[PDB]
Each structure stands twice: as C-alpha cells, then as structure tokens.
C-alpha cells in the first residue's frame, strides 16, 4: 500500500464520484478506479459499498477513511517542517 | 513521496548501511540507494551525509526520521484495526 492509494480513496469518498475524484486528482478514471480496486484487493476488505450511486463507504471504509485523512495531513506536516529546516 | 520512500530510509538509518538495508527489505542495494536519492531529490533536501561511513543522518534527516518511524506505526495500526473489523 502506498500514499497514492490513500490520497486517491480520500478523493473518491469525499467527491462520491470516481470520475470527479479523477478529475480533481488531474487523472484518467480507469486508472484512479484500478487503483481503489488493488487498494481493497491488497488489504482484503470492502472499503466502498459496491455498486452504490453515490459512492459511499461501508462502515470499515468510513473507519479507513478517517484514519487515512489523518495520516496524509500528518505526512504534509512532516515534510513541511523537514524542509523549513534546511531550506 | 511514497511509503516505500520511507520504509526505505529508515531502514538505512537503523542499519547504518545501504546494503544492510537491502539485505533486510529483500530487495537489491542499488535500486533502495536509487530511491533514497529519489526521496532526497523530490524534497529538496539532504536526508543523509553524503559520503558518511557508517551512514549518518543530517539534523533534518533525523528529524524526518523521527516523525517517519511515527507515521509508518501509524499506517500498521490503521491496516490492521481496518482489517479487524471486516475479517
Ligand atoms: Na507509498
């Protein structure tokens, strides 16, 4: 699992849309869906309720989602200040 | 910047050696030494002295150390509750 799978589920959730979370992510959706796709095929899970228009997370997903908004805010605070260092 | 980057670098800053690192990911050394130039490339920074033997960490690279060993810690967590919870 790497970031972009993270900050491309984080899009997904919040836009309801795979092809709106594409575009906000300036990326084609068959490969920002994939992507989702390896993402849950890797941890064994259902993150999104399959087939569900708008795109909604199933209870584990919403779990996962919050946790990974945390993470990617705490990954932008680090490399914030780890730069402000050297400069 | 991906997780691999910082799986990468701390493992190089415990073994206090590239190829130790690479033993110890499974993985060849001159493709990790690639990607922690890679990481160091995209930052704009100096993670590592260069030229250091044992391999050393710049005052901000020890910094980016630190919060990275926190960070990965927390990914395990969120995996493995996510996972706990669907089973
Ligand atoms: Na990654």
Redesign the interface.
């Given at each position: 699992?790497?970031?972009?799978h993270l900050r491309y589920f984080v899009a997904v959730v919040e836009e309801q849309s795979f092809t709106k979370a594409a575009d906000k992510l300036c990326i084609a959706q068959p490969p920002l869906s994939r992507q989702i796709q390896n993402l849950e095929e890797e941890?064994?899970?259902?993150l999104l309720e399959r087939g569900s228009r708008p795109v909604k997370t199933?209870?584990?997903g919403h779990?996962?989602y919050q946790?990974?908004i945390?993470?990617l805010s705490?990954?932008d605070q680090?490399?914030s200040?780890?730069?402000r260092?050297?400069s």
């Open positions: 699992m790497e970031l972009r941890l064994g899970i259902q199933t209870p584990e779990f996962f946790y990974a945390k993470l705490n990954v680090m490399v200040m780890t730069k260092i050297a």
